[PDB]
């Protein structure tokens, strides 16, 4: 399948070079997989989700995304026009308030929730969780991410936007999960992207067009935007049978575009998520 005039990030993950505009992907498109977006919620009624999104848990007064961030990330995972895995099932877990803030205790509860909830859902090709959030180091937050991964869910987390070593941020610094840095359309590390030995992979993160609340769209930047590209790619690969939840991060790193990025500090991987699609 080919989507012409795709958002640049989708084109990038299906090409060995920057500058293309077509997203090539297998028609299976993540069907049969499930991705939990743990964030400010998801506007499930957005036409771009085609009825494939639903809220399953909120830690606040409402399950509505009053912010937009969670809807944007979900859109990159799995919306028709802006998503990597266009037929996946999306579940929203609202652990961030409408200002995009949340306490560590709530974020941990949200991870433990998904570890249990996945047992109640029909996801034959596997389960992914996308966490476009983080804050200062916390061993308890890392431990929660490690448990989620251990339970059999492919966990992808944002490296953070401090232009710093991600070792000082959580859950980015938990080695067992897949920590995602951001790049721009010229294959440069995004100027805000954290880096360091704990990063596993890079994805498109600068100027990413996706869904927004009020049935709209908008372009924003962050490691928060790169993370759903990797989460969607994982869902897409599990559906194809190429990898499992336990090994998807390693498989993505193994099959990545290598050495294409500039401004990567010594000690940080130079690997860009790539779907290896061949028609
Ligand atoms: O869009 C965002 C806003 C804040 C933030 C903080 C830590 C990690 C990722 C983040 O993404
Ligand atoms: Ca290349
Ligand atoms: Ca890792």
Curated annotation (Swiss-Prot):
Residues holding Ca(2+) 2: 16, 260
- Record text on cofactor binding: Binds 2 calcium ions per subunit.
Reaction it catalyzes: Hydrolysis of keratin, and of other proteins with subtilisin-like specificity. Hydrolyzes peptide amides
> Could you tell me what this protein does?
Hydrolyzes keratin at aromatic and hydrophobic residues.
Q: Which family does it belong to?
A: Belongs to the peptidase S8 family.
Which species is the source of this protein?
Answer: Parengyodontium album (Tritirachium album)
Q: What is its EC number?
A: 3.4.21.64
Q: List the disulfide bonds.
A: 34-123, 178-249
What name appears for this protein in its UniProt entry? Answer: Proteinase K
**A single GO BP annotation from the record?**
proteolysis
User: Cellular component terms, GO, for this chain's entry?
Assistant: extracellular region
């Amino acid at each position: 399948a080919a989507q012409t005039n795709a958002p640049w990030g989708l084109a990038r993950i299906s090409s060995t070079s920057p500058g293309t505009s077509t997203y090539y992907y297998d028609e299976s498109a993540g069907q049969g997989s499930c991705v939990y977006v743990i964030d400010t919620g998801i506007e499930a009624s957005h036409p771009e989700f085609e009825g494939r999104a639903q809220m399953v848990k909120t830690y606040y007064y409402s399950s509505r995304d009053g912010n937009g961030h969670g809807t944007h990330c979900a859109g990159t995972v799995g919306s028709r026009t802006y998503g990597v895995a266009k037929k996946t099932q999306l579940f929203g877990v609202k652990v961030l308030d409408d200002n995009g803030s949340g306490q560590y205790s709530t974020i941990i509860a949200g991870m433990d929730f998904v570890a249990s909830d996945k047992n109640n859902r029909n996801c034959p090709k596997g389960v992914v969780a996308s966490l476009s959030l983080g804050g200062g180091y916390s061993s308890s937050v890392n431990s929660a991410a490690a448990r989620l991964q251990s339970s059999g869910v492919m966990v992808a987390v944002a490296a953070g936007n401090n232009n710093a070593d991600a070792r000082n941020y959580s859950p980015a610094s938990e080695p067992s999960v897949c920590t995602v840095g951001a790049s721009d359309r010229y294959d440069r590390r995004s100027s805000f992207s954290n880096y360091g030995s704990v990063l596993d992979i890079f994805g498109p993160g600068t100027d990413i067009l996706s869904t927004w609340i009020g049935g709209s769209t908008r372009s924003i930047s962050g490691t928060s935007m790169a993370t759903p590209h990797v989460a969607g790619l994982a869902a897409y690969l599990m559906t194809l049978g190429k990898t499992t939840a336990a090994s998807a991060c390693r498989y993505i790193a193994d099959t990545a575009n290598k050495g294409d990025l500039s401004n990567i500090p010594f000690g940080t991987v130079n690997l860009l998520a790539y779907n290896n699609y061949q028609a």
